[PDB]
Design a protein around this ligand. Structure first.
Ligand SMILES: *[C@@H]1O[C@H](CO)[C@@H](O)[C@H](O)[C@H]1NC(C)=O
Lengths: 49, 48, 125
């Protein structure tokens, strides 16, 4: 009484409603420190003339 | 050297015939490595 | 998970008997183990459950005060000490694992479990 476990399982069944269906989530956070920037984009090239 | 967050390593290999001290003469060191570490460095040591 | 029961057999009323149930596989730190029983011609009936972390126990009314459930984490085994055996206690007892982390231990009395052992016969004379 008044002493509960903080976690609970999710019910993911194939027949479950989309609201209750499992979703994989990735959250990407970008950081600019007082350090070199080491994650850059592809920076595409062109042909040479 | 450790500048602007980049760790730069230059080096040069030369043949020599002297057993006491540094040979007198002249040769330039071409860069080998540039490490983007951003790590504060103030001390170091050698490993043999 | 794989569940393997042991310890069933014939005992006289008033005696005591210890069942064993070794748990292997994904033995969750925040799971629970329960013992249930099914008598011939009767529906499966919840007996007792224990949470793996902490070892707090919950008992069905039919067994409260007589039976004790315990588990050895190091050995990944749960035990049922069946004291004060009665005629009605005669049944096949199955040990099951609750992968569902339920906050309220009593909910494990009614939760449908995931995996079941093979059963061990207990007969009370
Ligand atoms: C390096 O040291 C200086 C002073 O010693 C300090 O201001 C600076 O925050 C340090 N930088 C890192 C990346 O630790």
């Amino acid at each position: 009484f008044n002493c509960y476990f903080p976690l609970q399982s999710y019910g993911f069944q194939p027949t479950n409603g989309v609201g209750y269906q499992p979703y994989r989530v990735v959250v990407l956070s970008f950081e600019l420190l007082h350090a070199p920037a080491t994650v850059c984009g592809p920076k595409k090239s062109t042909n040479l003339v | 050297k450790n500048i602007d967050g980049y760790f730069k390593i230059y080096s040069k290999h030369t043949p020599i015939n002297l057993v006491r001290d540094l040979p007198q003469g002249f040769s330039a060191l071409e860069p080998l490595v540039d490490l983007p570490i951003g790590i504060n460095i103030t001390r170091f040591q050698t490993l043999l | 998970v794989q569940l393997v029961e042991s310890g069933g057999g014939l005992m006289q009323a008033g005696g005591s008997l210890r069942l064993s149930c070794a748990v292997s596989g994904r033995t969750f730190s925040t799971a629970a183990m329960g013992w249930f029983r099914q008598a011939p011609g009767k529906e499966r009936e919840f007996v007792a459950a224990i949470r793996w972390s902490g070892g707090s126990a919950y008992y069905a009314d039919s067994v409260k005060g007589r039976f004790t459930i315990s588990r050895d984490k190091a050995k990944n085994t749960v035990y049922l000490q069946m004291n004060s055996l009665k005629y009605e206690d005669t049944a096949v007892y199955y040990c099951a694992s609750y992968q569902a982390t339920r906050s309220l231990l009593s909910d494990y009395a009614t939760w449908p479990y995931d995996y079941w052992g093979q059963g061990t016969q207990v007969t009370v004379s």
